[PDB]
Design an enzyme around this catalytic site. Sequence first.
Site, PDB file in Angstrom:
ATOM      1  N   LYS A  10      36.052  87.884  37.175  1.00  0.00           N
ATOM      2  CA  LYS A  10      37.217  88.209  36.321  1.00  0.00           C
ATOM      3  C   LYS A  10      38.402  87.348  36.758  1.00  0.00           C
ATOM      4  O   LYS A  10      38.744  87.338  37.940  1.00  0.00           O
ATOM      5  CB  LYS A  10      37.577  89.693  36.369  1.00  0.00           C
ATOM      6  CG  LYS A  10      38.458  90.096  35.199  1.00  0.00           C
ATOM      7  CD  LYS A  10      37.716  90.159  33.887  1.00  0.00           C
ATOM      8  CE  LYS A  10      37.308  91.531  33.445  1.00  0.00           C
ATOM      9  NZ  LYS A  10      36.295  91.505  32.355  1.00  0.00           N
ATOM     10  N   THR A  57      31.883  91.883  35.146  1.00  0.00           N
ATOM     11  CA  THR A  57      33.272  91.414  35.390  1.00  0.00           C
ATOM     12  C   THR A  57      34.231  92.597  35.220  1.00  0.00           C
ATOM     13  O   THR A  57      35.239  92.642  35.928  1.00  0.00           O
ATOM     14  CB  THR A  57      33.621  90.192  34.528  1.00  0.00           C
ATOM     15  OG1 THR A  57      33.769  90.590  33.168  1.00  0.00           O
ATOM     16  CG2 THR A  57      32.610  89.080  34.663  1.00  0.00           C
ATOM     17  N   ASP A  58      33.991  93.497  34.268  1.00  0.00           N
ATOM     18  CA  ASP A  58      34.848  94.701  34.131  1.00  0.00           C
ATOM     19  C   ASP A  58      34.858  95.500  35.432  1.00  0.00           C
ATOM     20  O   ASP A  58      35.865  96.071  35.772  1.00  0.00           O
ATOM     21  CB  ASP A  58      34.335  95.540  32.960  1.00  0.00           C
ATOM     22  CG  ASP A  58      35.280  96.647  32.623  1.00  0.00           C
ATOM     23  OD1 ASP A  58      36.309  96.349  31.951  1.00  0.00           O
ATOM     24  OD2 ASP A  58      35.051  97.815  33.087  1.00  0.00           O
ATOM     25  N   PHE A 159      63.698  53.237  46.965  1.00  0.00           N
ATOM     26  CA  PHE A 159      62.327  52.739  46.751  1.00  0.00           C
ATOM     27  C   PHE A 159      62.367  51.241  46.551  1.00  0.00           C
ATOM     28  O   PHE A 159      62.702  50.719  45.498  1.00  0.00           O
ATOM     29  CB  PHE A 159      61.585  53.492  45.630  1.00  0.00           C
ATOM     30  CG  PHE A 159      60.119  53.189  45.618  1.00  0.00           C
ATOM     31  CD1 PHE A 159      59.335  53.526  46.704  1.00  0.00           C
ATOM     32  CD2 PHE A 159      59.537  52.429  44.612  1.00  0.00           C
ATOM     33  CE1 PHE A 159      58.000  53.193  46.728  1.00  0.00           C
ATOM     34  CE2 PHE A 159      58.189  52.125  44.613  1.00  0.00           C
ATOM     35  CZ  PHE A 159      57.413  52.520  45.687  1.00  0.00           C
ATOM     36  N   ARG A 176      68.645  56.197  44.390  1.00  0.00           N
ATOM     37  CA  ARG A 176      68.096  56.787  43.147  1.00  0.00           C
ATOM     38  C   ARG A 176      68.119  58.304  43.293  1.00  0.00           C
ATOM     39  O   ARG A 176      68.263  58.864  44.394  1.00  0.00           O
ATOM     40  CB  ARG A 176      66.688  56.293  42.865  1.00  0.00           C
ATOM     41  CG  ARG A 176      65.635  56.753  43.877  1.00  0.00           C
ATOM     42  CD  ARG A 176      64.218  56.304  43.581  1.00  0.00           C
ATOM     43  NE  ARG A 176      63.298  56.899  44.535  1.00  0.00           N
ATOM     44  CZ  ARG A 176      61.962  56.821  44.452  1.00  0.00           C
ATOM     45  NH1 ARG A 176      61.373  56.086  43.512  1.00  0.00           N
ATOM     46  NH2 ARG A 176      61.228  57.448  45.348  1.00  0.00           N
ATOM     47  N   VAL A 227      58.414  58.893  48.205  1.00  0.00           N
ATOM     48  CA  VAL A 227      57.813  60.239  48.236  1.00  0.00           C
ATOM     49  C   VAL A 227      56.775  60.313  49.370  1.00  0.00           C
ATOM     50  O   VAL A 227      56.768  61.319  50.095  1.00  0.00           O
ATOM     51  CB  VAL A 227      57.203  60.584  46.869  1.00  0.00           C
ATOM     52  CG1 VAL A 227      56.479  61.903  46.917  1.00  0.00           C
ATOM     53  CG2 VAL A 227      58.287  60.625  45.794  1.00  0.00           C
ATOM     54  N   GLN A 228      55.933  59.311  49.470  1.00  0.00           N
ATOM     55  CA  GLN A 228      54.872  59.210  50.507  1.00  0.00           C
ATOM     56  C   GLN A 228      55.497  59.500  51.876  1.00  0.00           C
ATOM     57  O   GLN A 228      54.952  60.313  52.643  1.00  0.00           O
ATOM     58  CB  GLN A 228      54.208  57.829  50.468  1.00  0.00           C
ATOM     59  CG  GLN A 228      53.350  57.510  49.255  1.00  0.00           C
ATOM     60  CD  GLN A 228      54.047  56.962  48.020  1.00  0.00           C
ATOM     61  OE1 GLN A 228      55.228  57.211  47.786  1.00  0.00           O
ATOM     62  NE2 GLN A 228      53.283  56.233  47.206  1.00  0.00           N
ATOM     63  N   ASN A 254      56.668  62.690  40.909  1.00  0.00           N
ATOM     64  CA  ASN A 254      57.962  61.990  40.952  1.00  0.00           C
ATOM     65  C   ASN A 254      58.515  62.115  39.536  1.00  0.00           C
ATOM     66  O   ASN A 254      57.996  61.460  38.647  1.00  0.00           O
ATOM     67  CB  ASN A 254      57.790  60.559  41.433  1.00  0.00           C
ATOM     68  CG  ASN A 254      59.099  59.890  41.776  1.00  0.00           C
ATOM     69  OD1 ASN A 254      60.142  60.506  41.668  1.00  0.00           O
ATOM     70  ND2 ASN A 254      59.038  58.623  42.169  1.00  0.00           N
ATOM     71  N   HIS A 256      60.886  61.403  37.055  1.00  0.00           N
ATOM     72  CA  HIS A 256      61.815  60.263  36.971  1.00  0.00           C
ATOM     73  C   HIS A 256      63.068  60.604  36.188  1.00  0.00           C
ATOM     74  O   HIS A 256      62.978  61.242  35.117  1.00  0.00           O
ATOM     75  CB  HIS A 256      61.113  59.064  36.347  1.00  0.00           C
ATOM     76  CG  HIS A 256      59.853  58.676  37.052  1.00  0.00           C
ATOM     77  ND1 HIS A 256      59.811  58.214  38.371  1.00  0.00           N
ATOM     78  CD2 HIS A 256      58.582  58.668  36.619  1.00  0.00           C
ATOM     79  CE1 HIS A 256      58.531  58.000  38.674  1.00  0.00           C
ATOM     80  NE2 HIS A 256      57.773  58.268  37.630  1.00  0.00           N
TER      81      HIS A 256
HETATM   82  O1  LIG Z   1      28.486  88.282  28.993  1.00  0.00           O
HETATM   83  C1  LIG Z   1      28.959  88.968  29.884  1.00  0.00           C
HETATM   84  N1  LIG Z   1      28.808  88.665  31.216  1.00  0.00           N
HETATM   85  C2  LIG Z   1      29.249  89.366  32.306  1.00  0.00           C
HETATM   86  O2  LIG Z   1      28.992  88.948  33.451  1.00  0.00           O
HETATM   87  C3  LIG Z   1      30.043  90.482  31.935  1.00  0.00           C
HETATM   88  N2  LIG Z   1      30.720  91.403  32.672  1.00  0.00           N
HETATM   89  N3  LIG Z   1      31.344  92.205  31.843  1.00  0.00           N
HETATM   90  N4  LIG Z   1      31.077  91.828  30.585  1.00  0.00           N
HETATM   91  C4  LIG Z   1      30.281  90.745  30.579  1.00  0.00           C
HETATM   92  N5  LIG Z   1      29.779  90.024  29.590  1.00  0.00           N
HETATM   93  O1  LIG Z   2      58.492  57.195  45.881  1.00  0.00           O
HETATM   94  C1  LIG Z   2      57.867  56.448  45.146  1.00  0.00           C
HETATM   95  N1  LIG Z   2      56.539  56.152  45.340  1.00  0.00           N
HETATM   96  C2  LIG Z   2      55.739  55.306  44.620  1.00  0.00           C
HETATM   97  O2  LIG Z   2      54.554  55.140  44.963  1.00  0.00           O
HETATM   98  C3  LIG Z   2      56.407  54.781  43.483  1.00  0.00           C
HETATM   99  N2  LIG Z   2      55.989  53.966  42.478  1.00  0.00           N
HETATM  100  N3  LIG Z   2      56.984  53.819  41.637  1.00  0.00           N
HETATM  101  N4  LIG Z   2      58.040  54.515  42.081  1.00  0.00           N
HETATM  102  C4  LIG Z   2      57.734  55.152  43.225  1.00  0.00           C
HETATM  103  N5  LIG Z   2      58.439  55.955  44.004  1.00  0.00           N
HETATM  104 KR   LIG Z   3      59.497  64.344  48.673  1.00  0.00          KR
END
Ligand SMILES: O=c1[nH]c(=O)c2nn[nH]c2[nH]1
Ligand SMILES: O=c1[nH]c(=O)c2nn[nH]c2[nH]1
Ligand SMILES: [Kr]
Lengths: 296, 296, 296, 296
Positions: A10, A57-58, A159, A176, A227-228, A254, A256
């Site tokens: 679920k 799942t219920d 940069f 920047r 950023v790196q 990033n 921009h």
């Molecule tokens: O098709 C279904 N699969 C499940 O595993 C399930 N569990 N609740 N209802 C369901 N329906």
């Molecule tokens: O911080 C940055 N990293 C990058 O790799 C990059 N490429 N364009 N601008 C950038 N700025």
């Molecule tokens: Kr950053």
Amino acid sequence: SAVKAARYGKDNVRVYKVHKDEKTGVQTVYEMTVCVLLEGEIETSYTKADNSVIVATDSIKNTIYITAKQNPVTPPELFGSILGTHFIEKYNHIHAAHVNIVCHRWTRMDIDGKPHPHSFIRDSEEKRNVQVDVVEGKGIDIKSSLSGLTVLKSTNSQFWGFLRDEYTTLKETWDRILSTDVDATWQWKNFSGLQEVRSHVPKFDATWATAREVTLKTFAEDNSASVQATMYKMAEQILARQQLIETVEYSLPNKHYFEIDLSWHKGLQNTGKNAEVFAPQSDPNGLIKCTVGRSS
Amino acid sequence: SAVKAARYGKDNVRVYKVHKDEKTGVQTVYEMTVCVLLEGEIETSYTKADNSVIVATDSIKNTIYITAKQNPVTPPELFGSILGTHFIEKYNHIHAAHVNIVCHRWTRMDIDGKPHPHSFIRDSEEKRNVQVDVVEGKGIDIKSSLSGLTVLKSTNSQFWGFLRDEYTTLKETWDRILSTDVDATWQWKNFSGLQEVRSHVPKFDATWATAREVTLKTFAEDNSASVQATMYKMAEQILARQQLIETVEYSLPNKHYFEIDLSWHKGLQNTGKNAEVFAPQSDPNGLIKCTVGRSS
Amino acid sequence: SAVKAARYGKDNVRVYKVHKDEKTGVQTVYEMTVCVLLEGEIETSYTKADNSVIVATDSIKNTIYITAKQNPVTPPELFGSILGTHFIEKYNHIHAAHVNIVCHRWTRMDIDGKPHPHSFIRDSEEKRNVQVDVVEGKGIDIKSSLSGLTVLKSTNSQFWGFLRDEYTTLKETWDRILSTDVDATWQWKNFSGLQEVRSHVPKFDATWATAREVTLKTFAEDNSASVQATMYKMAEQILARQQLIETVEYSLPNKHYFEIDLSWHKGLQNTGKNAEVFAPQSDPNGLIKCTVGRSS
Amino acid sequence: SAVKAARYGKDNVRVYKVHKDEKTGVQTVYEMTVCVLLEGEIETSYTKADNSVIVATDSIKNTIYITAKQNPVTPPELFGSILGTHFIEKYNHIHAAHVNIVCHRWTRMDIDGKPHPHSFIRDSEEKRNVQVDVVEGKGIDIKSSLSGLTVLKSTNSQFWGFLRDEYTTLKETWDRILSTDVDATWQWKNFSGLQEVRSHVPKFDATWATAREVTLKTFAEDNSASVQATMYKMAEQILARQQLIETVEYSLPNKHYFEIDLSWHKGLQNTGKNAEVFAPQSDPNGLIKCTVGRSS
Ligand SMILES: O=c1[nH]c(=O)c2nn[nH]c2[nH]1
Ligand SMILES: O=c1[nH]c(=O)c2nn[nH]c2[nH]1
Ligand SMILES: [Kr]
Ligand SMILES: O=c1[nH]c(=O)c2nn[nH]c2[nH]1
Ligand SMILES: O=c1[nH]c(=O)c2nn[nH]c2[nH]1
Ligand SMILES: [Kr]
Ligand SMILES: [Kr]
Ligand SMILES: [Kr]
Ligand SMILES: [Kr]
Ligand SMILES: [Kr]
Ligand SMILES: [Kr]
Ligand SMILES: [Kr]
Ligand SMILES: [Kr]
Ligand SMILES: [Kr]
Ligand SMILES: [Kr]
Ligand SMILES: [Kr]
Ligand code: NA
Ligand code: NA
Ligand code: NA
Ligand code: NA
């Protein structure tokens, strides 16, 4: 044909929990979205229409709510570990449980400078997340993250000195805008089981707070070369501060902000040192990723 | 056939502006999304392919950037009024300009308890908006709003004594969750033109701050009888605090949090006084609207 | 203070209905999202905490489902009219009901060239909508629309002869891309009540089909002078084809596709007649609106 | 600390291309969103502020447009392979290129039953995607997919015979709605390089068409025992039809449509055989995944 991999469960299970201190009247709320996917001896549900191996799942959804009623939902690393452990222990033929939790912010309101006992604000869409993989015989693999932390600095980003060839148009810059949405993940040492996760419970909130504080302070104070180079500084500081983390991963767009040349209009100066008005670009965006671990 | 109404322009114009105090080093950023739609003697662009009456939407976009370069972008009520006035004054045949501005949050970061001079965080998706209608010979109609302010209280909300008939299943409650996304709009007295807007400039930021403070404090402190009764209290307080506002409008979803009966499972008690775990409902939702003005 | 306007109800009510022909086995599905907002003698719910005048939003939701069980859900103009009429007739103090319906596409699958009796595909996110305002003593005001119809033509769009001044950079063009998301609304003559709506039932599906066909054929065949001139042609044709429509409104974004000058790279020619590769722009966008009615 | 993994580049690069047959006047359009991430000897950009190893993301963006100008953009498996091969061949220190392409639908309009030469409709938000991993010395790994294919069947879906314990409330059913959004991925045999991809070009469009046809026909005709059992049938048929595919993966939400008991209201019968009106559930949702390969 044969099943090579399978998991089912679920998704998008919204959960709220309230704690009420009856003595102080203070109430605390928690809200999350949960996904639980199970693996095990389930291939015959796919190949032979054998639903006897399916925990509906219920039923998984009911179990999430029952688990939240009977256990703490914080820290999410613990909740996930409890929930995943429940499935592999309860069902002999279920051998792994994959639990993803997104935690939504409900920050206590300050009204006239005093914390309110039962009123909360969503102070951003920043999330705290976990991915908890509970695997029978292999323990518990936890990745913790913060995501959706949107920041901008208006100077002290540069940069220049990048590769220039016949594909290059970008001008070097010594001043920047830098803006990003922070996705930061820390990967915990493998835990042997739920007892070992419980033994580290205080470390989860503390490491999240450290990751957030390091990210903000590094972003604000680094006179960024790229950023790196800035993201690597954040990752190395988080690793230095929690020995129980194996790796730190950042994924950073990033976002921009382009200068607008207005010199065609009455000689207006709006570039370089005179740049005041910019056009934020929705797309495309740089995308910069690192995984940092400890050196040999 | 004939044109009964027409307006055209540029939507989704993203704008950033930075202010740099060269003396203190403090930088302040502003970011918005702008839409400008024009009306006037333009029917022949529709009926006769007469583009001579069209101020290109691209030109409208250039004008937004040039206006931001040459004028303050705050408060947004003023920026909108300047931008709309520009179009009806510059172009004889343009008789109205409809300016919608969404302001995005860039809150200064505190690093080690000190405000950072050039680093900012998006602390939620809450917006401050304006709708500025500049109409030649009829002045300037301004609606100001806050939107996307997401709040929850965990008690001190009630809903009982409503109409019960053969369509009614809802149980009365004396203690529920209340959560909403606040959309609050205040409609200013008509202004005669840009000079009158300029004469009220300090009132715009102050009235936004009042609206926000009244909304939060009323939500947190009202032991709410209904969304209807709580929103009316917010509206009447804002009207009492700014005589230059004619009306206050709220549009509030009731974002339901449903109790989960777990009594089928080992007799778990999770309803009424024992309600701890809830299911937040994505849809449907109540939607409650009011416009409040001053009594005869 | 006093209430100047108020309406409340349930939004985002998802509804599915199936029709089963027991004789042929053919099944037909309908899915919509419904909003019902009520007005009436409800001011005291806002001003005095008087919930006795409130038909709970939960009850409004139950009524939508019960109405869908007991009545046709197609055409949506009829369903809306039935639902709104129910509220003003059932509740003495409710004087208006505002019903908005979004209809979702479930198009029957063709399997090996034969229509399948019970399998459907969502063939786009295009919607068919209604806004039905049922007002006690004033009848039923219906606006019908199609929305989200996304189209592009790769030539036979032009834009030249527009106003050029010191704000203008846009180059005239005799051959561009035109792409839009069509929002087209037709406003029906006021109906006296539900009987008059029922008397026109066949006209609703037919007028939707006409509006869609006119929009597509006009877009494809007009050698367009402007969005303005093309949309006016669509509106005038729809008015000519349904006398029971008072007005036709279009709201059309101009989703720009920009040429990319590659001449800096090995003298590549990718502009004017050699334009092959373009950059679709997410924002900003032109926004062009018209309401067309019948001439004096 | 040390860099354990790194990749960087440009995301969300929107690209359009037109083909014009000058002889027939027929124009054909292609639109995509592209992401290119590079890996190689780039760790010193992260650890030492060494931008000399960075091919700027802006340059990567220029290269995408130049590549689209000089090469076919269809099938996307080929375009991706060309683009990724360009980076590892051009730059000695770049050792892998990760290319993700989302293809947007632009289906030729039929006007009065004849295909229009230059007008197109977005007939759904269904995508065709590729993930192309070009790794120096390891060849080209391609995953092809369709996604966003939204379908519903109104009967001939069942779900019974699943595990029942103290967590189970779900009723067995012999006749339910089944609705999903299809995400289907086929993983190609490793290709040695761009020449081997070129040698298989006709297989890409044909295998996409087969995957789509198998998915629709299987969904429509299977009297489904479960999502699990139906998806496995689709996967095994696609594998049987293309020997150059190693695995087929489905990821399928179970988008629940709940019965509505109306028996509380005038004894209305709307469950089991009398079920006509349902409540589509936005969340939670089942999520069912399989990877199918060939048996030992
Ligand atoms: O098709 C279904 N699969 C499940 O595993 C399930 N569990 N609740 N209802 C369901 N329906
Ligand atoms: O911080 C940055 N990293 C990058 O790799 C990059 N490429 N364009 N601008 C950038 N700025
Ligand atoms: Kr950053
Ligand atoms: O505050 C509320 N107002 C209403 O009108 C209503 N209807 N159901 N629940 C409700 N809650
Ligand atoms: O069709 C168009 N209408 C306009 O009003 C316009 N302005 N710029 N481009 C335009 N294209
Ligand atoms: Kr929770
Ligand atoms: Kr940390
Ligand atoms: Kr701005
Ligand atoms: Kr409220
Ligand atoms: Kr106010
Ligand atoms: Kr429906
Ligand atoms: Kr158009
Ligand atoms: Kr029509
Ligand atoms: Kr393309
Ligand atoms: Kr399925
Ligand atoms: Kr296939
Ligand atoms: Na087990
Ligand atoms: Na004028
Ligand atoms: Na009435
Ligand atoms: Na290389």
